[PDB]
């Protein structure tokens, strides 16, 4: 429901 704005930094 959330996008890789779950702060994907990897």
């Amino acid at each position: 429901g959330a996008t890789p704005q779950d702060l994907n930094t990897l």
């Epitope: 429901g1 959330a2 890789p4 704005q5 779950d6 702060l7 994907n8 930094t9 990897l10």
Partner: antibody, heavy 112, light 108 residues
Framework: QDQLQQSGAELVRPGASVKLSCKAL????????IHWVKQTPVHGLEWIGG????????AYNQKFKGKATLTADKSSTTAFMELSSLTSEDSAVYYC?????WGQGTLVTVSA | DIKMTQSPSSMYTSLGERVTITCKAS??????LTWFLQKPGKSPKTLIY???RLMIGVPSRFSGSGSGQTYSLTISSLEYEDMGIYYC?????????FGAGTKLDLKR
């Protein structure tokens, strides 16, 4: 979107190893990082590390680097966490999280 | 290591009351913060993510706010099912760090 499913409660002897598993369901497994977190009454909640199943990139807390090994299997959409040389201090609940979703946790009891 | 200072640490509240829990980060975390609740013998349930996004299925009581260093979670009218420990989680940078928790008790 759906969820994380963790492997069952584990009962190991001092100095052994455990491999915990975390199955991702209902979402594109390769677009999100999977993180492992440890919880004990003493220390509270602590981050171990995480993997990005797309790129394979990993990151670890300096305290678990050398003890914890993180791997991911794309065909089974399962993230794994290996723990070596266990002592009673490793006795805890282990959780995999997507940061928004949490697995249910696996209890690892280290005892003789 | 970013440090999260959650407060208060335990609160004595009433059913139907409006509660406010806070998290200060030792530096700026760009709204990368989650709020989750854990009940006794139970896995964490995230309520809010990216500082103020409700999670599918969470009552609209719950509401997050802040920017920079000071974040908040407000529970507009406490219900019995809300009782447990609340935590904030910063995911701006590694290592991930958590507040120490906020325990809610019905006063009497």
């Amino acid at each position: 979107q759906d969820q994380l499913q963790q492997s069952g409660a584990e009962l190991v002897r001092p100095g052994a190893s455990v491999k915990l598993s975390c199955k991702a369901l209902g979402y594109i497994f390769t677009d999100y990082e999977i993180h492992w977190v440890k919880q004990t009454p003493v220390h509270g909640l602590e981050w171990i590390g995480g993997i990005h199943p797309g790129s394979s990139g990993t990151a670890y807390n300096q305290k678990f680097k050398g003890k914890a090994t993180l791997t991911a299997d794309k065909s089974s959409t399962t993230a794994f966490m290996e723990l070596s040389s266990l002592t009673s201090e490793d006795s805890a609940v282990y959780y995999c999280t997507r940061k928004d979703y949490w697995g249910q946790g696996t209890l690892v009891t280290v005892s003789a | 290591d970013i440090k999260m200072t959650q407060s208060p640490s335990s609160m004595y509240t009433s059913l139907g009351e409006r509660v406010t829990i806070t998290c200060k980060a030792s530096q700026d975390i760009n709204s990368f913060l989650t709020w989750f609740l854990q009940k006794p013998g139970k896995s964490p349930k995230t309520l809010i993510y990216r500082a103020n996004r409700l999670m599918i299925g969470v009552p609209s009581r719950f509401s997050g706010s802040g920017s920079g260093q000071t974040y908040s979670l407000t529970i507009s009218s406490l219900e019995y099912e809300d009782m447990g420990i609340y935590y904030c989680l910063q995911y701006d940078d590694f290592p991930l760090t958590f507040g120490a928790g906020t325990k809610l008790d019905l006063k009497r």
